[PDB]
Amino acid sequence: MIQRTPKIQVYSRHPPENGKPNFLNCYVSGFHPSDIEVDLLKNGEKMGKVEHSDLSFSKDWSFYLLYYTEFTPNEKDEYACRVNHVTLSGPRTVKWDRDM
């Protein structure tokens, strides 16, 4: 049996403008099995109210999910996405980069 790693993308719903309310998105895809832990982090801390989509998969059978929360991008706050899966040696953190 083969198990596949999660591709991780951290981005914002709308273009990031300081002071303006927005949505932080962590899209995880191409993994298997479906079990997976995903957390949105503000300054290394787990965010409060984080929603996620319903489990689904692509044509290559790999699963995908979107986690997202409300956030207001500013200057001092640091945002990231922490993902853990059976294919990983441990949780993987991907920082939110406004250029990607």
């Binding site: 083969i2 998105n25 479906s34 044509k59 059978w61």
Partner: protein, 276 residues
């Protein structure tokens, strides 16, 4: 242009933790509208789109019934698969099934879908003719003998060509405003430092629908594939999609690269350069 309704079933066994999980999600094109999770306190078909909420109680009750039957069936399927591959009762295993219909422009079934996998690998799939099956291995051919014996293909063809297409059309009408729309992407090129003699040109396409889109790079008119990176199309969470394609370009050569965008929401395919 052409539309489709697809259902996705996922069944996950979990030895020593009770019954397997069974999720079913419904999609019209790139828009989810229904869910069913056996791991919910009170399992039942739920609306995930606004244009389906107005469906009568009969609809939701019957859908719930069908969902439950499917769940049980797949719970049996997992054990059967254990028997076919001669596997232990301790391991966790997965069965996935995607099935649906592509409503063509002629109003007829452009393509029918009914394919399933075991532990992430092809298991059995309905062929294009919608009369024959393709089994991935010798274990799936048991299931093939079974489905051929009961003329399952005929029944399912009956479903695809009829009820499936019809419900698809109804969904398309009730959600015309969000389903029958083509939103073009907002595009733009950004520059990023990489090396003392190299850089990155990132082409951005945001807030478009449907997801289908073509993002390419060209060097002085000739397609460019080397030193490129095209991330998987991602969701905005608001019913839109995003995508960017970057290229590593030697300093001073920026003006020679162009980005090309194709989307049904665009009257004419776009050509972009980095602008000051």
């Amino acid at each position: 242009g052409s539309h489709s309704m697809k259902y996705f079933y996922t069944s996950v066994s979990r030895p020593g933790r009770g019954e397997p999980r069974f999720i079913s999600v419904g999609y019209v094109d790139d828009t989810q509208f229904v869910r069913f999770d056996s791991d919910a306190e009170s399992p039942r078909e739920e609306p995930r789109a606004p244009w389906v909420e107005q469906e009568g109680p009969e609809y939701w009750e019957e859908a719930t019934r069908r969902a439950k039957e499917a769940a049980q069936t797949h719970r049996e399927n997992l054990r059967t698969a254990l028997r076919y591959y001669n596997q232990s009762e301790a391991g966790s295993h997965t069965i996935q099934k995607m099935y649906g219909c592509d409503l063509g422009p002629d109003g007829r079934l452009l393509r029918g879908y009914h394919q399933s996998a075991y532990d992430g690998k092809d298991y059995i799939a309905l062929n294009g003719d919608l009369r024959s099956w393709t089994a991935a291995d010798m274990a799936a051919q048991n299931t093939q003998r079974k489905w051929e014996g009961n003329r399952y293909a005929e029944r399912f063809r009956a479903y695809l060509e009829g009820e499936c297409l019809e419900w698809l059309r109804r969904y398309l009408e009730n959600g015309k405003e969000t389903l029958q729309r083509a939103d073009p992407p907002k595009t733009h090129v950004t520059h990023h430092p990489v090396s003392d003699h190299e850089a990155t040109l990132r082409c951005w396409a945001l807030g478009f629908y449907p997801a289908e889109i073509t993002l390419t790079w060209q060097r002085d008119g000739e397609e460019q594939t080397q030193d490129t990176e095209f991330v998987e199309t991602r969701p905005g969470g608001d019913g839109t999609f995003q995508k960017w394609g970057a290229v590593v370009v030697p300093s001073g050569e920026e003006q020679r690269y162009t980005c090309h965008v194709q989307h049904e929401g665009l009257p004419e395919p776009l050509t972009l350069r980095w602008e000051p």
